[PDB]
Protein backbone atom coordinates (compact mmCIF):
# COMPACT_ATOMS: atom_id res chain seq x y z
CA UNK A 1 0.00 0.00 0.00
CA UNK A 2 3.12 2.23 0.65
CA UNK A 3 1.51 5.17 2.59
CA UNK A 4 3.17 8.17 4.37
CA UNK A 5 0.21 9.24 6.63
CA UNK A 6 1.53 9.80 10.21
CA UNK A 7 0.36 10.57 13.83
CA UNK A 8 -3.25 9.66 14.87
CA UNK A 9 -3.56 5.89 14.01
CA UNK A 10 -3.62 2.51 15.88
CA UNK A 11 -3.88 -1.33 15.14
CA UNK A 12 -1.35 -1.55 12.20
CA UNK A 13 -3.42 -0.02 9.32
CA UNK A 14 -5.74 -1.94 6.83
CA UNK A 15 -7.99 1.13 7.43
CA UNK A 16 -10.16 0.91 4.24
CA UNK A 17 -13.44 -1.09 4.64
CA UNK A 18 -13.83 -3.86 1.97
CA UNK A 19 -10.44 -3.57 0.16
CA UNK A 20 -9.85 -7.21 -1.06
CA UNK A 21 -12.04 -10.24 -2.19
CA UNK A 22 -15.67 -10.04 -3.60
CA UNK A 23 -15.16 -6.21 -4.02
CA UNK A 24 -14.14 -3.55 -3.02
CA UNK A 25 -11.68 -2.58 -4.44
CA UNK A 26 -10.83 -2.61 -8.23
CA UNK A 27 -10.01 -5.69 -10.43
CA UNK A 28 -13.28 -4.98 -12.33
CA UNK A 29 -11.37 -4.81 -15.06
CA UNK A 30 -8.42 -7.11 -14.01
CA UNK A 31 -6.85 -7.81 -17.50
CA UNK A 32 -4.66 -5.92 -20.05
CA UNK A 33 -2.83 -3.32 -17.85
CA UNK A 34 -6.13 -1.37 -17.12
CA UNK A 35 -6.33 -2.22 -13.34
CA UNK A 36 -6.44 1.49 -12.14
CA UNK A 37 -8.64 2.71 -15.11
CA UNK A 38 -12.12 2.42 -13.32
CA UNK A 39 -10.89 5.05 -10.76
CA UNK A 40 -10.41 7.36 -13.80
CA UNK A 41 -13.83 6.31 -15.29
CA UNK A 42 -15.75 7.21 -12.08
CA UNK A 43 -13.84 10.57 -11.85
CA UNK A 44 -14.39 11.63 -15.57
CA UNK A 45 -18.12 10.92 -14.84
CA UNK A 46 -20.57 12.76 -15.90
CA UNK A 47 -23.33 10.27 -16.97
CA UNK A 48 -22.88 6.42 -17.21
CA UNK A 49 -25.66 5.70 -19.77
CA UNK A 50 -24.19 7.40 -22.91
CA UNK A 51 -25.38 7.44 -26.58
CA UNK B 1 41.31 14.18 53.39
CA UNK B 2 38.56 15.35 54.44
CA UNK B 3 38.81 14.58 58.22
CA UNK B 4 36.50 14.85 61.29
CA UNK B 5 36.82 17.76 63.80
CA UNK B 6 37.54 15.30 66.72
CA UNK B 7 40.79 14.20 64.93
CA UNK B 8 41.53 17.52 63.08
CA UNK B 9 42.25 19.10 66.55
CA UNK B 10 44.64 16.16 67.39
CA UNK B 11 46.64 16.87 64.16
CA UNK B 12 47.14 20.25 65.96
CA UNK B 13 49.51 18.23 68.34
CA UNK B 14 50.99 15.49 66.02
CA UNK B 15 52.76 15.07 62.63
CA UNK B 16 51.05 12.96 59.90
CA UNK B 17 54.30 11.13 58.78
CA UNK B 18 56.41 10.65 62.00
CA UNK B 19 56.08 7.37 63.96
CA UNK B 20 57.11 8.22 67.55
CA UNK B 21 59.55 6.28 69.83
CA UNK B 22 57.65 4.51 72.70
CA UNK B 23 60.58 5.44 75.06
CA UNK B 24 60.32 9.24 74.19
CA UNK B 25 56.51 9.69 73.67
CA UNK B 26 55.72 8.70 77.34
CA UNK B 27 53.75 11.99 77.95
CA UNK B 28 52.22 12.15 74.40
CA UNK B 29 50.19 8.85 74.35
CA UNK B 30 47.73 10.19 77.04
CA UNK B 31 47.60 13.58 75.19
CA UNK B 32 46.29 12.48 71.70
CA UNK B 33 42.99 10.98 73.07
CA UNK B 34 39.70 12.58 71.78
CA UNK B 35 36.88 9.93 71.80
CA UNK B 36 33.70 9.45 73.96
CA UNK B 37 34.92 5.82 74.44
CA UNK B 38 38.29 4.48 75.74
CA UNK B 39 41.12 4.61 73.13
CA UNK B 40 43.80 1.84 72.96
CA UNK B 41 47.25 1.04 71.50
CA UNK B 42 47.25 -2.15 69.38
CA UNK B 43 50.06 -4.23 67.73
CA UNK B 44 49.76 -5.33 64.05
CA UNK B 45 52.10 -8.20 62.92
CA UNK B 46 52.61 -9.54 59.37
CA UNK B 47 53.48 -13.26 58.81
CA UNK B 48 55.11 -15.67 57.98
CA UNK B 49 55.46 -18.80 57.49
CA UNK B 50 52.94 -19.97 54.82
CA UNK B 51 50.06 -17.54 53.99
CA UNK B 52 47.60 -20.44 53.14
CA UNK B 53 48.57 -23.75 54.89
CA UNK B 54 46.45 -24.33 58.06
CA UNK B 55 49.16 -26.63 59.54
CA UNK B 56 51.02 -23.28 60.16
CA UNK B 57 47.94 -21.53 61.71
CA UNK B 58 48.89 -19.73 65.01
CA UNK B 59 46.60 -19.78 68.14
CA UNK B 60 47.02 -19.08 71.91
CA UNK B 61 46.58 -16.72 74.90
CA UNK B 62 49.08 -14.60 76.98
CA UNK B 63 48.86 -13.12 80.57
CA UNK B 64 49.25 -9.29 80.95
CA UNK B 65 49.11 -6.80 83.96
CA UNK B 66 45.78 -5.33 82.61
CA UNK B 67 44.63 -8.40 80.52
CA UNK B 68 42.12 -7.28 77.82
CA UNK B 69 41.97 -3.71 79.33
CA UNK B 70 39.46 -4.86 82.04
CA UNK B 71 38.74 -7.62 84.59
CA UNK B 72 36.56 -10.59 83.47
CA UNK B 73 33.60 -12.33 85.22
CA UNK B 74 34.48 -16.08 85.35
CA UNK B 75 31.99 -18.98 85.66
CA UNK B 76 32.98 -22.54 86.75
CA UNK B 77 31.13 -25.85 86.10
CA UNK B 78 32.21 -28.16 88.96
CA UNK B 79 30.43 -30.53 91.37
CA UNK B 80 31.21 -30.86 95.12
CA UNK B 81 33.91 -29.21 97.30
CA UNK B 82 36.30 -28.50 94.32
CA UNK B 83 33.78 -25.76 93.25
CA UNK B 84 34.27 -23.88 96.59
CA UNK B 85 38.05 -23.91 95.84
CA UNK B 86 37.41 -22.13 92.47
CA UNK B 87 34.92 -19.70 94.19
CA UNK B 88 37.81 -18.71 96.56
CA UNK B 89 40.36 -18.50 93.64
CA UNK B 90 38.55 -16.28 91.02
CA UNK B 91 34.97 -17.54 90.10
CA UNK B 92 31.86 -15.26 90.52
CA UNK B 93 29.33 -17.95 89.41
CA UNK B 94 29.28 -21.73 90.16
CA UNK B 95 27.55 -23.80 87.41
CA UNK B 96 25.58 -27.10 87.36
CA UNK B 97 22.78 -28.82 85.29
CA UNK B 98 20.27 -26.13 86.55
CA UNK B 99 22.43 -23.45 84.74
CA UNK B 100 22.77 -25.50 81.48
CA UNK B 101 19.01 -24.90 80.88
CA UNK B 102 19.48 -21.06 81.12
CA UNK B 103 22.55 -20.97 78.76
CA UNK B 104 20.66 -23.06 76.13
CA UNK B 105 17.50 -20.85 76.50
CA UNK B 106 19.79 -17.80 75.89
CA UNK B 107 20.90 -16.06 79.19
CA UNK B 108 24.61 -15.89 80.29
CA UNK B 109 26.37 -13.28 82.53
CA UNK B 110 30.09 -14.27 82.25
CA UNK B 111 33.16 -13.64 80.03
CA UNK B 112 34.91 -17.06 80.53
CA UNK B 113 33.62 -20.61 81.28
CA UNK B 114 35.86 -23.30 82.91
CA UNK B 115 34.92 -26.95 83.74
CA UNK B 116 36.31 -30.03 85.58
CA UNK B 117 36.45 -33.31 83.53
CA UNK B 118 33.58 -35.18 85.32
CA UNK B 119 31.41 -31.97 85.22
CA UNK B 120 32.20 -31.49 81.44
CA UNK B 121 29.54 -34.23 80.69
CA UNK B 122 26.89 -31.45 81.19
CA UNK B 123 28.77 -28.60 79.40
CA UNK B 124 29.26 -30.90 76.33
CA UNK B 125 25.50 -30.22 75.55
CA UNK B 126 26.18 -26.41 75.18
CA UNK B 127 28.96 -26.65 72.48
CA UNK B 128 26.80 -24.98 69.72
CA UNK B 129 25.50 -21.96 71.81
CA UNK B 130 28.96 -21.39 73.45
CA UNK B 131 30.78 -22.06 70.09
CA UNK B 132 29.96 -18.78 68.11
CA UNK B 133 30.98 -16.74 71.26
CA UNK B 134 34.42 -18.42 71.74
CA UNK B 135 33.05 -19.26 75.24
CA UNK B 136 33.15 -23.12 75.05
CA UNK B 137 35.84 -24.92 77.20
CA UNK B 138 38.15 -27.48 75.48
CA UNK B 139 40.70 -29.89 77.19
CA UNK B 140 43.00 -29.63 74.09
CA UNK B 141 43.75 -25.92 74.99
CA UNK B 142 43.74 -26.58 78.81
CA UNK B 143 40.30 -24.90 79.60
CA UNK B 144 39.20 -28.26 81.14
CA UNK B 145 41.36 -29.61 84.05
CA UNK B 146 40.92 -31.12 87.61
CA UNK B 147 42.76 -28.05 89.12
CA UNK B 148 39.88 -25.65 88.15
CA UNK B 149 40.92 -23.22 90.96
CA UNK B 150 44.14 -22.38 89.03
CA UNK B 151 42.30 -22.27 85.64
CA UNK B 152 39.68 -19.64 86.78
CA UNK B 153 42.59 -17.68 88.37
CA UNK B 154 44.50 -17.75 85.01
CA UNK B 155 41.48 -15.99 83.38
CA UNK B 156 40.78 -13.55 86.31
CA UNK B 157 44.50 -12.53 86.47
CA UNK B 158 44.05 -10.96 82.95
CA UNK B 159 44.96 -12.68 79.63
CA UNK B 160 44.47 -11.84 75.90
CA UNK B 161 43.51 -14.54 73.28
CA UNK B 162 44.56 -14.48 69.60
CA UNK B 163 44.74 -16.28 66.20
CA UNK B 164 46.10 -15.23 62.77
CA UNK B 165 43.74 -14.01 60.02
CA UNK B 166 43.71 -14.50 56.17
CA UNK B 167 47.03 -14.23 54.25
CA UNK B 168 48.98 -14.16 57.59
CA UNK B 169 48.22 -11.07 59.75
CA UNK B 170 47.51 -10.83 63.54
CA UNK B 171 46.22 -7.87 65.67
CA UNK B 172 46.10 -7.58 69.52
CA UNK B 173 45.64 -4.72 72.09
CA UNK B 174 48.57 -3.97 74.50
CA UNK B 175 47.08 -1.11 76.64
CA UNK B 176 44.69 1.85 77.02
CA UNK B 177 46.22 5.20 75.84
CA UNK B 178 45.52 6.63 79.36
CA UNK B 179 47.48 3.72 81.03
CA UNK B 180 51.19 4.02 82.08
CA UNK B 181 53.22 4.53 78.84
CA UNK B 182 56.51 3.78 80.72
CA UNK B 183 55.41 0.07 80.78
CA UNK B 184 54.58 -0.22 77.02
CA UNK B 185 58.26 -1.16 76.20
CA UNK B 186 58.12 -3.82 79.02
CA UNK B 187 54.67 -5.37 78.25
CA UNK B 188 55.38 -5.43 74.46
CA UNK B 189 58.35 -7.79 75.12
CA UNK B 190 56.14 -10.06 77.33
CA UNK B 191 53.63 -10.26 74.40
CA UNK B 192 56.32 -10.81 71.69
CA UNK B 193 58.40 -13.50 73.54
CA UNK B 194 55.17 -15.48 74.21
CA UNK B 195 53.94 -15.13 70.55
CA UNK B 196 57.47 -16.23 69.39
CA UNK B 197 57.19 -19.43 71.57
CA UNK B 198 53.84 -20.10 69.73
CA UNK B 199 55.72 -20.83 66.40
CA UNK B 200 54.20 -23.88 64.52
CA UNK B 201 56.04 -27.27 64.64
CA UNK B 202 56.57 -27.24 60.81
CA UNK B 203 57.71 -23.54 60.79
CA UNK B 204 61.06 -23.02 58.92
CA UNK B 205 63.59 -20.14 58.54
CA UNK B 206 61.38 -17.08 59.38
CA UNK B 207 58.24 -16.14 61.42
CA UNK B 208 57.65 -12.32 61.39
CA UNK B 209 57.60 -10.28 58.13
CA UNK B 210 56.82 -6.79 59.66
CA UNK B 211 55.73 -5.20 63.00
CA UNK B 212 53.58 -2.03 63.31
CA UNK B 213 51.92 -0.30 66.34
CA UNK B 214 49.07 2.31 66.26
CA UNK B 215 46.37 4.11 68.33
CA UNK B 216 42.54 3.76 67.76
CA UNK B 217 41.79 5.86 64.59
CA UNK B 218 45.14 7.62 65.28
CA UNK B 219 48.92 7.91 64.72
CA UNK B 220 51.56 5.11 64.64
CA UNK B 221 54.44 4.56 67.15
CA UNK B 222 57.99 3.29 66.42
CA UNK B 223 60.16 0.48 67.90
CA UNK C 1 -14.71 -21.02 16.47
CA UNK C 2 -18.48 -20.33 17.14
CA UNK C 3 -19.99 -19.75 20.68
CA UNK C 4 -20.62 -17.29 22.63
CA UNK C 5 -22.09 -19.12 25.68
CA UNK C 6 -24.50 -18.74 28.62
CA UNK C 7 -22.81 -18.37 32.08
CA UNK C 8 -23.78 -18.81 35.79
CA UNK C 9 -23.00 -16.52 38.79
CA UNK C 10 -24.34 -18.98 41.51
CA UNK C 11 -26.62 -18.50 44.58
CA UNK C 12 -25.36 -16.59 47.70
CA UNK C 13 -24.72 -18.42 51.02
CA UNK C 14 -28.07 -18.93 53.00
CA UNK C 15 -26.65 -17.47 56.32
CA UNK C 16 -24.42 -14.51 55.25
CA UNK C 17 -25.82 -13.51 51.76
CA UNK C 18 -22.22 -13.73 50.34
CA UNK C 19 -21.64 -15.18 46.81
CA UNK C 20 -17.85 -15.17 47.56
CA UNK C 21 -18.49 -17.55 50.50
CA UNK C 22 -20.72 -19.61 48.11
CA UNK C 23 -17.83 -19.99 45.56
CA UNK C 24 -15.47 -20.87 48.47
CA UNK C 25 -17.78 -23.76 49.66
CA UNK C 26 -18.07 -24.91 46.00
CA UNK C 27 -14.21 -25.14 45.71
CA UNK C 28 -14.25 -26.81 49.19
CA UNK C 29 -16.96 -29.28 47.89
CA UNK C 30 -15.73 -32.93 47.67
CA UNK C 31 -17.92 -36.06 47.02
CA UNK C 32 -20.94 -33.74 46.12
CA UNK C 33 -22.29 -33.59 49.78
CA UNK C 34 -22.00 -29.71 49.95
CA UNK C 35 -23.50 -29.32 53.52
CA UNK C 36 -20.20 -30.72 54.94
CA UNK C 37 -18.23 -27.70 53.59
CA UNK C 38 -20.46 -25.22 55.61
CA UNK C 39 -19.28 -26.94 58.82
CA UNK C 40 -15.53 -26.56 57.84
CA UNK C 41 -15.30 -22.85 56.69
CA UNK C 42 -16.46 -19.81 58.76
CA UNK C 43 -17.68 -22.33 61.46
CA UNK C 44 -15.36 -20.85 64.17
CA UNK C 45 -13.54 -17.55 64.97
CA UNK C 46 -11.92 -18.94 68.21
CA UNK C 47 -9.39 -20.88 65.96
CA UNK C 48 -8.28 -17.75 63.97
CA UNK C 49 -8.02 -15.73 67.23
CA UNK C 50 -5.74 -18.67 68.32
CA UNK C 51 -3.07 -17.45 65.77
CA UNK C 52 -2.59 -14.21 63.68
CA UNK C 53 -6.30 -13.30 62.94
CA UNK C 54 -7.16 -9.73 64.18
CA UNK C 55 -10.90 -8.78 64.44
CA UNK C 56 -13.81 -10.35 62.42
CA UNK C 57 -13.71 -7.76 59.53
CA UNK C 58 -10.54 -9.74 58.38
CA UNK C 59 -11.88 -13.31 59.12
CA UNK C 60 -12.46 -13.86 55.32
CA UNK C 61 -11.12 -10.65 53.57
CA UNK C 62 -7.51 -12.05 54.03
CA UNK C 63 -8.34 -14.21 50.92
CA UNK C 64 -10.03 -11.31 48.93
CA UNK C 65 -8.55 -7.73 49.20
CA UNK C 66 -5.19 -8.95 50.68
CA UNK C 67 -4.06 -10.14 47.14
CA UNK C 68 -4.46 -9.32 43.41
CA UNK C 69 -3.51 -12.03 40.81
CA UNK C 70 -2.88 -10.73 37.23
CA UNK C 71 -1.19 -13.50 35.11
CA UNK C 72 -0.79 -17.31 34.60
CA UNK C 73 2.24 -19.03 32.89
CA UNK C 74 2.66 -21.97 30.32
CA UNK C 75 3.56 -21.72 26.56
CA UNK C 76 1.75 -20.18 23.50
CA UNK C 77 2.40 -20.44 19.69
CA UNK C 78 3.42 -17.29 17.71
CA UNK C 79 3.88 -17.73 13.95
CA UNK C 80 5.63 -21.08 13.20
CA UNK C 81 7.02 -21.69 16.81
CA UNK C 82 6.06 -22.02 20.55
CA UNK C 83 7.35 -19.79 23.40
CA UNK C 84 6.79 -19.45 27.19
CA UNK C 85 4.25 -16.54 27.56
CA UNK C 86 2.43 -15.09 30.64
CA UNK C 87 -1.38 -14.83 29.94
CA UNK C 88 -3.89 -12.29 31.35
CA UNK C 89 -6.08 -13.83 34.19
CA UNK C 90 -9.83 -13.38 33.54
CA UNK C 91 -11.63 -10.67 35.65
CA UNK C 92 -14.19 -12.96 37.51
CA UNK C 93 -11.72 -15.80 38.38
CA UNK C 94 -9.45 -12.87 39.57
CA UNK C 95 -11.19 -12.96 43.03
CA UNK C 96 -11.73 -16.82 43.14
CA UNK C 97 -8.27 -18.21 42.04
CA UNK C 98 -6.60 -17.88 45.50
CA UNK C 99 -9.54 -19.97 46.92
CA UNK C 100 -8.00 -23.11 45.28
CA UNK C 101 -4.49 -22.11 46.51
CA UNK C 102 -5.82 -22.01 50.14
CA UNK C 103 -8.18 -25.08 49.95
CA UNK C 104 -5.45 -27.25 48.30
CA UNK C 105 -2.75 -26.16 50.82
CA UNK C 106 -5.06 -27.11 53.76
CA UNK C 107 -6.57 -30.31 52.13
CA UNK C 108 -3.13 -31.84 51.26
CA UNK C 109 -1.58 -31.02 54.72
CA UNK C 110 -1.02 -33.88 57.23
CA UNK C 111 -2.24 -32.24 60.49
CA UNK C 112 -5.68 -33.85 61.46
CA UNK C 113 -8.69 -31.44 61.98
CA UNK C 114 -9.70 -29.97 58.56
CA UNK C 115 -11.70 -27.08 60.14
CA UNK C 116 -8.47 -26.20 62.05
CA UNK C 117 -6.14 -26.78 58.97
CA UNK C 118 -8.25 -24.19 57.09
CA UNK C 119 -8.22 -21.61 59.99
CA UNK C 120 -4.41 -22.13 60.24
CA UNK C 121 -4.06 -21.64 56.42
CA UNK C 122 -6.06 -18.35 56.69
CA UNK C 123 -3.74 -17.29 59.60
CA UNK C 124 -0.68 -18.04 57.39
CA UNK C 125 -2.27 -15.80 54.66
CA UNK C 126 -2.93 -13.03 57.28
CA UNK C 127 0.92 -12.91 57.93
CA UNK C 128 1.52 -12.77 54.09
CA UNK C 129 4.06 -15.73 54.15
CA UNK C 130 4.71 -18.73 51.80
CA UNK C 131 1.56 -20.56 50.48
CA UNK C 132 -0.79 -18.80 47.98
CA UNK C 133 1.06 -15.40 48.27
CA UNK C 134 4.26 -16.84 46.67
CA UNK C 135 2.15 -18.62 43.96
CA UNK C 136 1.13 -15.01 43.00
CA UNK C 137 4.74 -13.67 43.29
CA UNK C 138 6.55 -16.52 41.37
CA UNK C 139 4.55 -15.86 38.12
CA UNK C 140 4.84 -12.02 38.46
CA UNK C 141 8.67 -12.39 38.87
CA UNK C 142 8.56 -14.61 35.74
CA UNK C 143 6.49 -12.01 33.76
CA UNK C 144 8.99 -9.22 34.79
CA UNK C 145 11.56 -11.12 32.60
CA UNK C 146 9.10 -12.14 29.80
CA UNK C 147 7.37 -9.19 27.94
CA UNK C 148 7.74 -9.50 24.10
CA UNK C 149 4.52 -11.58 23.54
CA UNK C 150 0.98 -11.41 25.05
Amino acid sequence: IKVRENEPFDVALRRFKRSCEKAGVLAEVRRREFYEKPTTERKRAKASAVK
Amino acid sequence: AKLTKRMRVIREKVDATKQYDINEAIALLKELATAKFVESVDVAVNLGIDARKSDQNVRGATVLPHGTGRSVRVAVFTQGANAEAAKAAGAELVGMEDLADQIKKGEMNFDVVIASPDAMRVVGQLGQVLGPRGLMPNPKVGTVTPNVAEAVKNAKAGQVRYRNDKNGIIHTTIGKVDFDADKLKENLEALLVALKKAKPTQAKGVYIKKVSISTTMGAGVAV
Amino acid sequence: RRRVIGQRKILPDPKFGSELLAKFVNILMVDGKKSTAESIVYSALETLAQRSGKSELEAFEVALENVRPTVEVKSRRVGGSTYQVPVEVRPVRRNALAMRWIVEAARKRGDKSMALRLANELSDAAENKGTAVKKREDVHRMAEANKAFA
Binding site: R4, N6, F9, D10 | - | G79, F149
Partner: protein, 117 residues
Protein backbone atom coordinates in the same frame (compact mmCIF):
# COMPACT_ATOMS: atom_id res chain seq x y z
CA UNK D 1 29.05 18.80 27.12
CA UNK D 2 26.56 21.79 27.15
CA UNK D 3 22.79 22.29 26.84
CA UNK D 4 21.62 22.76 23.19
CA UNK D 5 17.79 22.16 23.36
CA UNK D 6 17.82 21.13 19.61
CA UNK D 7 18.42 17.93 17.54
CA UNK D 8 17.13 15.59 14.77
CA UNK D 9 15.89 11.95 14.93
CA UNK D 10 15.45 8.65 12.99
CA UNK D 11 13.02 5.82 13.96
CA UNK D 12 12.84 2.54 11.95
CA UNK D 13 10.70 -0.63 12.36
CA UNK D 14 10.62 -3.81 10.17
CA UNK D 15 9.65 -7.53 10.53
CA UNK D 16 13.22 -8.46 11.64
CA UNK D 17 14.51 -5.36 13.63
CA UNK D 18 13.70 -1.92 15.26
CA UNK D 19 16.05 1.07 16.00
CA UNK D 20 16.21 4.70 17.34
CA UNK D 21 18.96 7.32 16.56
CA UNK D 22 19.27 11.02 17.64
CA UNK D 23 21.86 13.36 15.99
CA UNK D 24 22.49 17.09 15.23
CA UNK D 25 21.86 19.07 11.96
CA UNK D 26 25.71 19.54 11.88
CA UNK D 27 26.05 15.68 11.72
CA UNK D 28 27.13 15.02 15.37
CA UNK D 29 26.10 11.78 17.13
CA UNK D 30 24.03 12.50 20.30
CA UNK D 31 22.28 9.17 21.20
CA UNK D 32 21.55 5.67 19.81
CA UNK D 33 19.49 2.57 20.71
CA UNK D 34 18.61 -0.76 18.97
CA UNK D 35 16.56 -3.87 19.84
CA UNK D 36 19.95 -5.77 20.10
CA UNK D 37 21.15 -3.00 22.50
CA UNK D 38 17.91 -3.71 24.44
CA UNK D 39 19.12 -7.41 24.27
CA UNK D 40 16.44 -8.99 21.94
CA UNK D 41 16.75 -11.79 19.24
CA UNK D 42 14.91 -13.57 16.36
CA UNK D 43 11.05 -13.44 16.06
CA UNK D 44 10.99 -11.13 19.20
CA UNK D 45 13.41 -8.39 17.84
CA UNK D 46 10.57 -6.78 15.69
CA UNK D 47 7.89 -6.60 18.49
CA UNK D 48 6.13 -3.27 19.40
CA UNK D 49 7.41 -3.86 23.00
CA UNK D 50 11.07 -4.11 21.77
CA UNK D 51 10.54 -0.73 20.00
CA UNK D 52 8.96 1.03 23.06
CA UNK D 53 11.87 -0.02 25.40
CA UNK D 54 14.59 1.06 22.88
CA UNK D 55 12.95 4.55 22.65
CA UNK D 56 13.76 5.18 26.38
CA UNK D 57 17.42 3.94 26.09
CA UNK D 58 18.07 6.66 23.48
CA UNK D 59 16.26 9.22 25.76
CA UNK D 60 18.90 8.28 28.44
CA UNK D 61 21.86 8.91 26.00
CA UNK D 62 20.77 12.57 25.33
CA UNK D 63 19.67 13.31 28.95
CA UNK D 64 22.03 16.32 29.66
CA UNK D 65 21.41 18.15 26.29
CA UNK D 66 18.05 19.83 27.37
CA UNK D 67 16.10 18.55 24.29
CA UNK D 68 12.24 18.68 24.28
CA UNK D 69 11.58 19.20 20.50
CA UNK D 70 13.61 17.49 17.69
CA UNK D 71 13.01 17.05 13.90
CA UNK D 72 11.91 13.42 13.28
CA UNK D 73 12.13 11.02 10.31
CA UNK D 74 10.05 7.74 10.22
CA UNK D 75 11.02 4.52 8.35
CA UNK D 76 9.75 0.97 7.62
CA UNK D 77 6.27 -0.72 7.76
CA UNK D 78 6.63 -2.69 11.07
CA UNK D 79 4.18 -2.27 14.07
CA UNK D 80 7.13 -0.88 16.17
CA UNK D 81 6.38 2.42 14.27
CA UNK D 82 3.20 2.96 16.34
CA UNK D 83 4.69 2.20 19.82
CA UNK D 84 8.04 4.06 19.18
CA UNK D 85 6.03 7.23 18.23
CA UNK D 86 3.91 6.83 21.46
CA UNK D 87 7.23 6.40 23.36
CA UNK D 88 8.33 9.97 22.28
CA UNK D 89 5.96 11.15 25.07
CA UNK D 90 7.58 8.67 27.58
CA UNK D 91 10.94 10.27 26.47
CA UNK D 92 9.50 13.78 27.40
CA UNK D 93 9.37 14.98 23.71
CA UNK D 94 6.69 17.15 21.98
CA UNK D 95 6.98 17.24 18.15
CA UNK D 96 6.25 19.85 15.38
CA UNK D 97 8.31 18.26 12.51
CA UNK D 98 7.81 14.58 11.45
CA UNK D 99 8.08 12.94 7.94
CA UNK D 100 8.11 9.38 6.49
CA UNK D 101 11.58 8.81 4.90
CA UNK D 102 11.06 5.15 3.75
CA UNK D 103 12.34 4.31 0.20
CA UNK D 104 9.32 3.55 -2.08
CA UNK D 105 11.53 2.76 -4.30
CA UNK D 106 9.09 2.08 -7.27
CA UNK D 107 5.32 2.32 -8.07
CA UNK D 108 3.07 -0.27 -6.30
CA UNK D 109 2.20 -3.08 -5.60
CA UNK D 110 0.11 -5.95 -4.04
CA UNK D 111 -0.54 -5.30 -0.27
CA UNK D 112 0.18 -8.60 1.67
CA UNK D 113 -2.22 -10.88 3.69
CA UNK D 114 0.34 -11.80 6.49
CA UNK D 115 2.33 -9.46 8.86
CA UNK D 116 -0.32 -8.19 9.97
CA UNK D 117 -1.20 -10.93 11.18
Amino acid sequence: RKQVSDGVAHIHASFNNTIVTITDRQGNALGWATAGGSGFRGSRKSTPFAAQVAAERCADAVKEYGIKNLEVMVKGPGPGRESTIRALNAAGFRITNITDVTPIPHNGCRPPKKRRV
